[PDB]
Point group: C5
Chain length 114, copies 5
Amino acid sequence: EWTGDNTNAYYSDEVISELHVGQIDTSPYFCIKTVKANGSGIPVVACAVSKQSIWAPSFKELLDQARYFYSTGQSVRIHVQKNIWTYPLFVNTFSANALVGLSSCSATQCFGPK
Amino acid sequence: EWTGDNTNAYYSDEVISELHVGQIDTSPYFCIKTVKANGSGIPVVACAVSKQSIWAPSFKELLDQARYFYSTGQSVRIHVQKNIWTYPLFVNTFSANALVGLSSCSATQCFGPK
Amino acid sequence: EWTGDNTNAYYSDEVISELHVGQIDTSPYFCIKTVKANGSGIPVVACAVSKQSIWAPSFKELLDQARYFYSTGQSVRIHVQKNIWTYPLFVNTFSANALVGLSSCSATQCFGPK
Amino acid sequence: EWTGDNTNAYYSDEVISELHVGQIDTSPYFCIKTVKANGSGIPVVACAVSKQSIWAPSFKELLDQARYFYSTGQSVRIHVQKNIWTYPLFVNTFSANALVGLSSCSATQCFGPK
Amino acid sequence: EWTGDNTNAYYSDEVISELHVGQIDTSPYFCIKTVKANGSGIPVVACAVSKQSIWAPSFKELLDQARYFYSTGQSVRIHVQKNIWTYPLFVNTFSANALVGLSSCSATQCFGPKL
């Protein structure tokens, strides 16, 4: 598995606009909301859940990095794997996307897989 | 269990105004105090205790997130479970509320369950 | 045991003026110096020793919180247990006080036990 | 082995211009892009993979230090070992350089091996 | 052993002017360069190596603290044990000093062991 696998989805030139932390079924988790920096498009929602999914090893790295990029409001590419979380009420509040990666974006390019 | 369960309570458009750390019965703990950004209402007090209650696994995550929102002073939704802590001098100093989640808010919406 | 036990001492409306990190007998330790915000009185010195005493589990939490309040210079309540540390030159350089809690005091009262 | 070994390469007076975090084969990883502070030359790309290569033990230290130097925009010397990473798609997006060390610089010199 | 043992050395009112992170012989390490705030004397270099020397338990504590003091530029007292590291090339680039403690200073006194 890799953040960059073409079975994962990504969204470029986004800003993390909201951050949430909680717990589900013994797992601390966090979710982020991101919107296009130019103000267009539809928001993206993705979550990371501690000890849950193949992406569990990266939970702390992603939490720390989402925190940083959130605090600067800088433009980023968000990488997700769709249809991972299955609790329907959780999915309805947030989404089923597992967050799998984060890349800074310049005015010209995003530093990550495409 | 989930932050979003309707057996938990929540308060929106609050700011973390005080923060305390300590230890009880060999467990690190922290408490926060939040007030409405607009000055109305009464304060919310909630505590997390590192090896107590079902919310134990997210102690560190909530401590780090509470520090972040405290240092920025931004408006948040605080999620609590009432009537958890039982030590009377502790409850009277702070409250019986366990802290179970923190959601950032924009001017119009809070990014978390409701 | 609890930060708020009446066998412990506390000093309100202080600021953290100095911070030291070191090691003794294979244990990381830190100490802080605090003074009344208003200049009155004498300083308080207290240390946490990572591997020693019932307060050991709270070492990291206390160090992280000591660092943050040190960096802001905001008013705090410092909570200590007196006469616990024993190495004579250590006590004489610093003190025999264990640091057992830190409360913010940005308001009328400090947010912690008294 | 050592960051300063003959058989590693280094590039001085660089600024960390991009940062990416992800996961590959159960291992969190991060990559950075650096460019010369004075605008000259060609960008350097280097990655660290938490469970892989002889540099694995330093993953957390390098991640934290890369993050700090990124957040400050300050001039650094970057040390890499060439031809480490093998997954072709990964190398194409980023590079095969393993990050093995970061050194801060002043105007004239960098504090690290030469 | 103790940071404050009189067999250790210390340098008061120093500014942490450079910082380096790397790896050696399986261990993450970091080194710092300090200079007297008043401009006098010679720079001090000291290093901490994860899981090496008696001071290994304090590696993360000292790294975090060295980062903080490095980022502020404030005046500090640096405590070292001399002649600890033996890698020849490593010592040539940096020094043999193990970092064993850091103390903040006011303009008139450092909050740490002396003598």
